Write an enzyme that holds these catalytic residues in place. Sequence first.
Site, PDB file in Angstrom:
ATOM      1  N   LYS A 118      77.297  88.577  59.170  1.00 27.02           N
ATOM      2  CA  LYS A 118      78.186  89.713  58.904  1.00 27.02           C
ATOM      3  C   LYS A 118      77.749  91.014  59.565  1.00 27.02           C
ATOM      4  O   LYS A 118      78.514  91.974  59.602  1.00 27.02           O
ATOM      5  CB  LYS A 118      78.341  89.956  57.402  1.00 27.02           C
ATOM      6  CG  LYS A 118      79.133  88.902  56.668  1.00 27.02           C
ATOM      7  CD  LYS A 118      80.523  88.693  57.275  1.00 27.02           C
ATOM      8  CE  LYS A 118      81.469  88.041  56.260  1.00 27.02           C
ATOM      9  NZ  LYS A 118      80.785  86.900  55.607  1.00 27.02           N
TER      10      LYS A 118
ATOM     11  N   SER B 124      76.117  78.272  52.280  1.00 22.33           N
ATOM     12  CA  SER B 124      77.170  77.897  53.218  1.00 22.33           C
ATOM     13  C   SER B 124      76.610  77.080  54.385  1.00 22.33           C
ATOM     14  O   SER B 124      77.291  76.204  54.918  1.00 22.33           O
ATOM     15  CB  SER B 124      77.904  79.140  53.744  1.00 22.33           C
ATOM     16  OG  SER B 124      77.034  80.007  54.446  1.00 22.33           O
TER      17      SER B 124
HETATM   18  C1  LIG Z   1      80.744  85.733  56.301  1.00 15.16           C
HETATM   19  C2  LIG Z   1      80.111  84.416  55.839  1.00 15.16           C
HETATM   20  C3  LIG Z   1      80.673  83.192  56.212  1.00 15.16           C
HETATM   21  C4  LIG Z   1      81.983  83.075  57.085  1.00 15.16           C
HETATM   22  O1  LIG Z   1      82.051  83.759  58.398  1.00 15.16           O
HETATM   23  P1  LIG Z   1      83.474  84.417  58.724  1.00 15.16           P
HETATM   24  O2  LIG Z   1      83.406  84.975  60.171  1.00 15.16           O
HETATM   25  O3  LIG Z   1      83.737  85.522  57.766  1.00 15.16           O
HETATM   26  O4  LIG Z   1      84.445  83.292  58.729  1.00 15.16           O
HETATM   27  C5  LIG Z   1      80.075  82.025  55.790  1.00 15.16           C
HETATM   28  N1  LIG Z   1      78.926  82.056  55.008  1.00 15.16           N
HETATM   29  C6  LIG Z   1      78.367  83.242  54.642  1.00 15.16           C
HETATM   30  C7  LIG Z   1      77.080  83.231  53.775  1.00 15.16           C
HETATM   31  C8  LIG Z   1      78.956  84.436  55.057  1.00 15.16           C
HETATM   32  O5  LIG Z   1      78.416  85.632  54.692  1.00 15.16           O
HETATM   33  C1  LIG Z   2      83.968  85.671  54.082  1.00 11.01           C
HETATM   34  C2  LIG Z   2      84.446  85.999  52.676  1.00 11.01           C
HETATM   35  C3  LIG Z   2      84.661  84.716  51.885  1.00 11.01           C
HETATM   36  C4  LIG Z   2      83.377  86.874  52.006  1.00 11.01           C
HETATM   37  C5  LIG Z   2      83.105  88.192  52.744  1.00 11.01           C
HETATM   38  C6  LIG Z   2      82.050  89.032  52.074  1.00 11.01           C
HETATM   39  O1  LIG Z   2      82.413  89.824  51.172  1.00 11.01           O
HETATM   40  O2  LIG Z   2      80.864  88.897  52.450  1.00 11.01           O
END
Ligand SMILES: *Cc1c(COP(=O)(O)O)cnc(C)c1O
Ligand SMILES: CC(C)CCC(=O)O
Lengths: 302, 302
Positions: free
Chosen positions: B40, B263
């Site tokens: 992010k 994730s």
């Molecule tokens: C942001 C995020 C994702 C997804 O990436 P996107 O570009 O927003 O699709 C997946 N896992 C974690 C832990 C994240 O912070």
């Molecule tokens: C990618 C989303 C599901 C969460 C974004 C965030 O608040 O980090």
Amino acid sequence: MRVEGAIGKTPVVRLAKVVEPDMAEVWVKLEGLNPGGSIKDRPAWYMIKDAEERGILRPGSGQVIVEPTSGNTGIGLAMIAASRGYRLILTMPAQMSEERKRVLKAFGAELVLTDPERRMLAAREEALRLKEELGAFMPDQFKNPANVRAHYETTGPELYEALEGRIDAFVYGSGTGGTITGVGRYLKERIPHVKVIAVEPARSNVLSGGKMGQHGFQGMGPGFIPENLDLSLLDGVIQVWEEDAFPLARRLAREEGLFLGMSSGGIVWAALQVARELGPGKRVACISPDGGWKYLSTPLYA
Amino acid sequence: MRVEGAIGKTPVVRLAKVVEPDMAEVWVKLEGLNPGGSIKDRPAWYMIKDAEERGILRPGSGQVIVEPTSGNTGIGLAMIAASRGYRLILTMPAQMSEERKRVLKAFGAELVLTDPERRMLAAREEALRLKEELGAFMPDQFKNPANVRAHYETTGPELYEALEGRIDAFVYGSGTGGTITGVGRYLKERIPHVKVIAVEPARSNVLSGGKMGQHGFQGMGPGFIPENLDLSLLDGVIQVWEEDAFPLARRLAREEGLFLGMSSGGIVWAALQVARELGPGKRVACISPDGGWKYLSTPLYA
Ligand SMILES: *Cc1c(COP(=O)(O)O)cnc(C)c1O
Ligand SMILES: CC(C)CCC(=O)O
Ligand SMILES: *Cc1c(COP(=O)(O)O)cnc(C)c1O
Ligand SMILES: CC(C)CCC(=O)O
């Protein structure tokens, strides 16, 4: 490429808010951006790689490695042992935090909790006992020359190159002594005037001729003079207080966007003092051992 | 250089233990090695930089930025706002963990805790109210094109270059949709045959035609289809279960020395399935959003 190959080549940032116009520039190398989360990734890999080169170890062998530590060195060793297939056993006082124990176990390290009242002594004794009983390899971080060599060959060159050979002073909070010795030697061989300043907790100021004591700068200030620390390289020693360093660490996070560890607060505070002494046209370089991620439950950020 | 300049250029590692001989190669880009601790950092910087370029913002102004998030985006935004001098307000459900709140506050972000029973809805409403009341800038991560552009201009090129243009499939667990859209487009413009596979929680499988639901893959699987996700790029969708992904995440840590986030476990599990389908001579690339450092108190590593 494997995780060990992702170690190093960390960035250096210049402070812009916590510094003042009458100060020399202050650059901070971010070692927290290593796969193991700290500068210890370097000596951890180097000590194991050195052991493989000397024939003590061969990767994927399942050979046993034992070291008395629960700090960043333990994490770095755990990461490398997991990647290269070694069985790692870490000894540490039973009063260890569940958080740290969880990180170590995540990497598959086996933990041996020793007499909480005997602090590091019991941990060292159990590690020696295991080394003897199992014929295991013990990195021996405070005296293994490969620790120093890691910084002489990677950390030093990186810093020198990033700052284009322009460094008037190098400031670091010594732990095993590896970083300040390795980087210090590398810099002094190329910069005639460069000053190498060690930083230690005022509460455990042995380099300053004081006495060891309990302190909150995790990772630095071991309370003794390690074999890996070359005192002949030092141009001075700055004692730091948590009372001054913690507030500074919080400023670094809120004002520079730099969320660093406890030792980083002490190191940068010292670097600022040196920067004020040198003045405007100069450059002070220092290193941030790790980020603040592991210290959210401490008085630094709690 | 400032912290924002330390974002990107992350390494890619090849798995060697959790994979099998009948699988294509599996490479993982480690976005946890960013100053903000996650992928992010890229969209956070890009959305703010884009706002400065369009004249909405000017750094060092103290202007207000507001966003309904307590996740990695909140951390990335907090870091950038601290470095560039903006006042950041983040809205989030009152049931937020003290750990996360501590990290955000460390960066100087102001937190507004909203109705815990209204989940994300109350958070979104308060952010809109503040944007209106204060004339503040709201990144709007799920629909801001700069999010996608960050990955089209940096993440994609990096991955492509590191793997020498040899990628048969790209696998990612979608959140805002920025990464898979940006990287996916970049790769498909250069690799005719490359397949772009999205990953989502089986418990909140909306891309698969299912229903939203509570799940443990923090950061991905928002329960809706974001505007930043270009469905036309997708060649498939893989649903993942925590029951399968968490054990895998633990194997990655113990066997590869890769201590990754929740994730990442789901994403890599999916990547393995794709790797088995493609076979030996192929290459599957995926991205690890963040490390395990923030999840020691979760069932993943607790
Ligand atoms: C942001 C995020 C994702 C997804 O990436 P996107 O570009 O927003 O699709 C997946 N896992 C974690 C832990 C994240 O912070
Ligand atoms: C990618 C989303 C599901 C969460 C974004 C965030 O608040 O980090
Ligand atoms: C290892 C460490 C240090 C000291 O570096 P050495 O090379 O061992 O002198 C300082 N702070 C932290 C957090 C460390 O882990
Ligand atoms: C540098 C020393 C004070 C601590 C080493 C460690 O166990 O991480």
